Scaffold this active site. Structure first.
Site, PDB file in Angstrom:
ATOM      1  N   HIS A 102       0.725  -1.258   0.046  1.00  0.00           N
ATOM      2  CA  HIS A 102      -0.006   0.033   0.024  1.00  0.00           C
ATOM      3  C   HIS A 102       0.787   1.405   0.130  1.00  0.00           C
ATOM      4  O   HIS A 102       0.349   2.165  -0.324  1.00  0.00           O
ATOM      5  CB  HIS A 102      -1.127  -0.008   1.361  1.00  0.00           C
ATOM      6  CG  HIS A 102      -2.285   0.506   1.022  1.00  0.00           C
ATOM      7  ND1 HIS A 102      -2.514   2.089   1.435  1.00  0.00           N
ATOM      8  CD2 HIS A 102      -3.251   0.430   0.124  1.00  0.00           C
ATOM      9  CE1 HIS A 102      -3.885   2.498   1.338  1.00  0.00           C
ATOM     10  NE2 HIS A 102      -4.081   1.546   0.362  1.00  0.00           N
ATOM     11  N   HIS A 327      -8.496  10.633  -0.500  1.00  0.00           N
ATOM     12  CA  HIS A 327      -7.818   9.372  -0.552  1.00  0.00           C
ATOM     13  C   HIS A 327      -6.580   9.615   0.182  1.00  0.00           C
ATOM     14  O   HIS A 327      -5.961   8.751   0.462  1.00  0.00           O
ATOM     15  CB  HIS A 327      -7.575   8.950  -2.069  1.00  0.00           C
ATOM     16  CG  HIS A 327      -6.907   7.677  -2.051  1.00  0.00           C
ATOM     17  ND1 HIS A 327      -5.466   7.224  -2.157  1.00  0.00           N
ATOM     18  CD2 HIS A 327      -7.530   6.420  -2.227  1.00  0.00           C
ATOM     19  CE1 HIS A 327      -5.205   6.464  -2.255  1.00  0.00           C
ATOM     20  NE2 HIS A 327      -6.347   5.476  -2.470  1.00  0.00           N
TER      21      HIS A 327
END
Ligand code: K8G
Length: 438
Positions: A102, A327
């Site tokens: 990630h 985000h």
């Protein structure tokens, strides 16, 4: 400003809200450095789009893509990159189930030095188009002269900590980058690295990663103030994992406990969680498609309805971004009146045990599934007791911290619901005239 914290450009806000924002083309511009080589750590990649973001004169310089994809997904990524001879790939090992790579980071090697970029956007067009995303820009790190012996280390230990993060991959292409970092002077870095890597950590390694790393830094480099119990904790994220059947299972027992740490000494601290409501998403610039990047599945949500009473709406008038879905992920510790903060973290880590770690083996082992990376702003690292919160993100004494969304956070109303990405919304159309049918 000494913080070098930026938001990405948003198409559709007025120019005053993009002045001081950065697009990926700006980050890769020749004005930032004469590019020799780069590494792009990320989760999702559009390689055709990514190459077009480099300046034309730099588009054949080597690029390494660091990803976590396996099997057919891995084949698809190699197929994307095959047309480009200058692109190599590094598959980060994910030996624990349900882990993800990630971390969002650029290593940019110049003729003139080195730059590190830790940010929150995938390398696809939509993540840089109409979303709220965060960027930390390192200084230009000069090379250490051949024959000179100096650490090049910062007061925050950033150089050693970054190398440690990269060593965890055990990857030949990243040892190259480790040797590049060794050769540069990172002493000017005023942020602390907070990384997650997959594994099971005990003893001396427990404090290296995840929320124990945050706890260790706050214990060592922050001070506890009187009425610390009144300073809330704020968490802000775009995805939620399974946290357990009640708040004592993880959220308020080890996550909150790590996050309320201040100083070396030995809860009713308020916890605000900011996560877009369905109405936030419906009326956003993107409409319901923004929810494609807010992964919260109905299967997980219905097991933890208790969590949603912590949820607060996305609001960002301070940066003109209330309609630009988040985000970015941020965590911070504001004063009871939200006028100061004791620290601020921007990271890839969502509200997830996978990202932050969960205690195992009678509290002696921290198990982390994923790769994550962020940077921690601590007042001590800037000669300060606390940060003043900046009034308006893009306005103008440079030692106030630019918090990118509104404080105090606004609780969901009784009819709000958290965005859940795999159920339909057919009651009211979005800003493009559409419903959401998963
Ligand atoms: O966009 C991403 O990098 C991403 C990838 C996977 C997941 N996930 O595991 O659900 C969440 C995110 C997120 O950051 O929202």
């Amino acid at each position: 400003n000494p913080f070098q914290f930026y938001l990405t450009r948003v198409s559709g806000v007025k120019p005053k809200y993009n002045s001081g924002a950065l697009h990926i083309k700006d980050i890769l511009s020749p004005l930032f450095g004469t590019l020799v080589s780069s590494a792009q750590f990320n989760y999702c990649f559009d390689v055709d789009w990514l190459v077009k973001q480099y300046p034309p004169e730099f588009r054949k310089k080597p690029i390494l893509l660091v990803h976590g994809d396996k099997r057919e997904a891995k084949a698809h990524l190699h197929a994307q990159a095959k047309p480009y001879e200058n692109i190599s790939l590094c598959q980060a090992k994910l030996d624990i189930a349900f882990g993800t790579h990630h971390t969002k980071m650029m290593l940019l090697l110049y003729e003139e030095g080195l730059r590190v970029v830790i940010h929150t956007s995938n390398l696809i067009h939509a993540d840089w188009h109409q979303k709220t995303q965060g960027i930390w820009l390192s200084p230009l790190y000069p090379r250490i002269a051949d024959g000179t012996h100096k650490s090049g280390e910062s007061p925050t230990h950033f150089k050693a900590d970054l190398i440690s993060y990269l060593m965890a991959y055990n990857a030949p292409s990243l040892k190259e980058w480790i040797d590049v970092i060794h050769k540069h002077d990172l002493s000017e870095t005023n942020v602390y690295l907070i990384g997650s890597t997959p594994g099971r950590f005990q003893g001396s390694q427990k404090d290296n990663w995840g929320h124990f790393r945050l706890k260790k830094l706050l214990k060592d480099h922050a001070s506890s103030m009187p009425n610390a119990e009144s300073w809330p904790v704020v968490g802000q994220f775009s995805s939620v994992g399974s946290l357990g059947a009640d708040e004592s299972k993880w959220l308020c027992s080890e996550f909150k406990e790590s996050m309320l740490t201040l100083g070396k000494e030995s809860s009713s601290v308020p916890l605000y969680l900011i996560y877009p409501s369905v109405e936030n998403v419906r009326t956003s610039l993107e409409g319901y498609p923004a929810g494609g990047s807010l992964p919260y599945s109905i299967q997980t949500a219905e097991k933890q309805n208790w969590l949603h009473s912590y949820f607060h709406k996305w609001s960002a008038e301070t940066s003109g971004r209330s309609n630009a879905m988040p985000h970015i992920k941020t965590y911070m510790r504001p004063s009871p009146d939200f006028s100061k903060i004791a620290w601020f973290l921007v990271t890839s880590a969502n509200l997830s045990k996978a990202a932050w770690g969960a205690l195992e083996k009678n509290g002696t082992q921290l198990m982390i599934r994923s790769y994550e990376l962020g940077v921690l702003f601590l007042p001590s690292a800037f000669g300060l007791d606390s940060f003043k919160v900046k009034q308006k993100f893009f306005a103008g004494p440079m030692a106030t911290f630019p918090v990118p969304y509104d404080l105090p956070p606004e609780l969901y109303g009784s009819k709000d619901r958290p965005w859940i990405w795999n159920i339909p919304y057919v009651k009211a159309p979005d800003t493009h005239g559409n419903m959401w049918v998963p």
